[PDB]
Design a protein around this ligand. Structure first.
Ligand code: ERY
Lengths: 96, 50, 7, 75, 64
RNA sequence: UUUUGUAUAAUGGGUCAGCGACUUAUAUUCUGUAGCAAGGUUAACCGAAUAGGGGAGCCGAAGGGAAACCGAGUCUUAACU
RNA sequence: AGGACCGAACCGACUAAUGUUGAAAAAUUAGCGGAUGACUUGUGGCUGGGGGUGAAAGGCCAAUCAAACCGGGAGAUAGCU
RNA sequence: UGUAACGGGGCUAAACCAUGCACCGAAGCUGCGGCAGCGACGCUUAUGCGUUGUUGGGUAGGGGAGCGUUCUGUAAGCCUG
RNA sequence: GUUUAUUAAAAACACAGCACUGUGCAAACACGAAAGUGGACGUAUACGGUGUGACGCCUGCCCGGUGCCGGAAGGUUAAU
RNA sequence: AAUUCCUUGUCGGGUAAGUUCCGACCUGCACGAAUGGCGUAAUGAUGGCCAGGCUGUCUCCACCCGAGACUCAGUGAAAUUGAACUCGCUGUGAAGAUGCAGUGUACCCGCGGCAAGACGGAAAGACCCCGUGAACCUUUACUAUAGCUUGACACUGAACA
RNA sequence: CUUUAAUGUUUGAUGUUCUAACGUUGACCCGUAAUCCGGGUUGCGGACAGUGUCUGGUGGGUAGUUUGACUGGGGCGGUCUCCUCCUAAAGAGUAACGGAGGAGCACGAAGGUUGGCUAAUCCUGGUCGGACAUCAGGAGGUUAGUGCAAUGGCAUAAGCCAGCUUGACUGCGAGCGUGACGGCGCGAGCAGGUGCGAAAGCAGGUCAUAGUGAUCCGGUGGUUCUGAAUGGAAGGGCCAUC
């Protein structure tokens, strides 16, 4: 990043924003790994036992990528619009 | 140069102000200047301040 | 000793 | 005592006769009005002439003072 | 060892979807009241990084 | 060799023989090639052991935003043709 | 008597010449100055490196001094050849 | 410093002007022989063979293809009093 | 008289003398993280520092600047 | 004038002739009174100038005596060196040629001499410039700091006014 | 609020006195054959001195460093950013220690709109009044004027005057122009809310081009956007701004 004594580009521009600490403990999952979990129930515990998220993860979204076919029951996970559409069209209950 | 920086502060719903320049030795008179406010979305009376 | 030197 | 000159500010005719422009394109940058605005051409605050419609550029002489005008034909 | 990140570059730039970098514009910190509001309105969104700039930026941000 | 330019009266070398200068480690990006492929791969360690375990982790499959959050959309904006 | 005078040993080093890959990394030859003193010399001690010592020239401190030598940081660094 | 202001000898044309025809004259162009790169067009693609065209001065530099030296396997093989 | 050992011996340095200034003695000052040594087993006719440089005739005016000495009423001013 | 630029100031003395010397005059560019002023006997391997004597310093060199140099025998270096079959001139040329062009001259090889050239040898120019070099030194450059100095608290207590 | 006054509630300051801390490089005795030291008497000082921590001053005594570049060699001088003209070779751009001039602002009107108007300089006539003030007419036609240098412009005025005003408004912005980039400039149209005008319309500063500095660091205001167990808050972020 040395420009010849000209003030460099990363020092000519203003730094901006901050880093949130809740973004490390959140992992979105797609529907394609929703069949990968053991059993038919999807919560934080089985998503960690099926290696989908990780140990430090506390929150999850189950956003629409695709490929869901089985009835699943999602517990305590936030679901988006199109994801809950595809999940309820697959058959299983979205939240209880 | 001789124009001092002053601001002009909203009257109704003051979460907003503009900033301008004013010469003190010619004009000690006030601005009132009915400008637009984006917070209350109307044209309000504004007032001179530091 | 500045005699041979081009000074 | 001399030795100062400003940076040249790139004035002139950008789009010539017959050229296809889109609306909003700059045709002439200038200081005064060497060229005056005509049909489908607007005059900016620094006397920039710009395309207010998309067509072809045309130069004319008009009026009782033989002045240059820039028109645009909506093609 | 592993490469260190230039941390001021990590405070200035952010990675995007197609691999480009986004940054804040640089005139909007102080004496703004002589700047016209069109200038300050146009300097407000985050821009993208140009390509020789992109070459000098990719070296300073080797990980992200 | 250095130069715009050297037979240059610019540098260097008396000659021979021997030795003498782009390396290694670790990360990262690109290219070639091989394996597997929406998957790929293990590290330390165990193991009589370049076998086999070990998936802790890492990268990829989703992004937008400073962030909360939303999510094939998202941000700006009172809301955007 | 005398930091008296002339003048050997002794101490020094003013001029010239020679030597300058020397007889000698500071001399020789011929003249020259002091020579009872603020003299010279032997033997032994003491002062040490930003320190010593200096009738002071940045002089001397082991043929080295506007900061000795040795060893270690150390393959300092060298946009220079 | 030595003629020394056609390169020289020498020239009253071997000088100058015009017109023309010959000829000499380069690593240019053609002829013949050979090698290599790139691109088209076919044979059945041992990713080759052929036909055509064109290219082939090179510093810094970029790209591609090789030769040779020492050591390891093949190799208790093979060569060698 | 001394001096650049090894290109400069001089007009340089020293000197006797002069003046200013510090120092009352557990002296000032110096070398010492300190103890302690030198000054000095001396004490103002002594010791240190600075300048000048035998002897003769003499050393004129300026205290604005800077340094030193004395005052400290008033302004400003630290830790607390 | 150890000081004076203009300058060899001007006048005088010394000389046949004196930018130095001596005495003056003051126009002191830019003397000056203890960073002392002006004298001064004696002293000085001290600076300048004049005179007498003396002479190879010189006019202008000559000869002689010894030590080398020269030859013979013995021993036996060194600096330097791209390779050499290593001429003059005039031109050209990275701009001053043994080496190029044109031209002239020149049998091969020593020995003693002399130094015009080989931009001769010697020492990565010491002058000049440059390096975001280095070292020392200076100071009312910056930032510190030893020392000196001030006050508070501690060692540190008791009475009074 | 004010002027002293007794009484207690508490410190401070100053001076004197005392000795028991501390000092003694005073005398004497012992360890001890000892001018070291320690201990014991005693004298002299005495809560001073001195030392530790904190602190103001002073401090080339010492240390670490800095002391720009261009430059017909360097130093001395001059310059360094921005605007206008020429060089500049009829697109743009284009160097010199080339030739000439300016800027580091002003203005709530000198901005917006509506309505209206049109110069300079001479000649004649007329109280003071005269080369030049005011008047009236004629000529002339933009040689004038532009808040400020030069150029380009300007009559439909961009010049001059009057009424009403705050668009010198917020969020954007198709598209272009110009830069290596950071950046800089022009912009029709759309949403909201206004001003002038009867209306078409015009207005998001000024006839245009100079009037300007990046980032970091902090100051102020608003917005739960985050907020280290939780609830706040601090501190960050974002927006406006210094
Ligand atoms: C005993 C014999 C010594 O030489 C001399 O005394 C002569 C008399 C010097 O001149 C002496 C005396 C004198 C006055 O020159 C005569 C003086 O100017 C020089 C600086 O030193 C010489 C030659 C100097 O050269 C000159 O140096 C000049 C910088 C540049 C000059 N060149 C341009 C031509 C060059 O020849 C110089 C540097 O000493 C040469 C270097 C190699 C030496 O040091 C060598 C070892 C010599 O000391 C020596 C040979 O032992």
């Amino acid at each position: 990043g040395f420009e010849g004594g000209q003030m460099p580009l990363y020092r000519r521009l203003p730094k901006f924003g901050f880093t949130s600490r809740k973004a490390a403990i959140t992992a979105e999952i797609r529907l394609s790994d929703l069949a990968k979990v053991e059993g038919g129930v999807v919560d934080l515990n089985t998503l960690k036992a099926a290696n989908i998220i990780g140990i430090q993860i506390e929150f999850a979204k189950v956003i629409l990528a695709g490929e869901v076919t089985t009835p699943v029951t999602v517990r305590g996970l936030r679901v988006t619009k199109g994801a809950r559409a595809a999940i309820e069209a697959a058959g299983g209950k979205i939240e209880e | 140069g001789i124009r001092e920086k002053i601001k002009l502060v909203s009257s109704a719903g003051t979460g907003h102000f503009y900033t301008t320049t004013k010469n003190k030795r010619t004009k000690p008179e006030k601005l009132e200047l009915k400008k637009f406010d984006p917070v209350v979305r109307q044209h309000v009376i504004y007032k001179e301040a530091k | 000793m500045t005699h041979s030197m081009r000074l | 005592r001399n030795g100062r000159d400003s940076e040249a500010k790139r004035l002139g005719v950008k789009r010539f006769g017959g050229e296809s422009v889109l609306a909003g394109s700059i045709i002439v940058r200038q200081r005064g009005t060497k060229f005056h605005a005509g049909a489908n051409v607007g005059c900016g605050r620094d006397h920039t002439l710009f395309a207010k419609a998309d067509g072809k550029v045309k130069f004319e002489v008009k009026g009782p003072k033989n002045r240059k005008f820039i028109s645009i034909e909506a093609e | 060892p592993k490469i260190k990140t230039v941390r001021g570059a990590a405070k200035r730039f952010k990675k995007t979807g197609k691999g480009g970098f986004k940054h804040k514009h640089a005139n909007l910190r102080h004496i703004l009241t002589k700047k016209a509001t069109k200038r300050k309105r146009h300097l407000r969104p985050k821009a993208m990084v140009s390509k020789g700039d992109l070459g000098l930026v990719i070296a300073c941000l080797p990980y992200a």
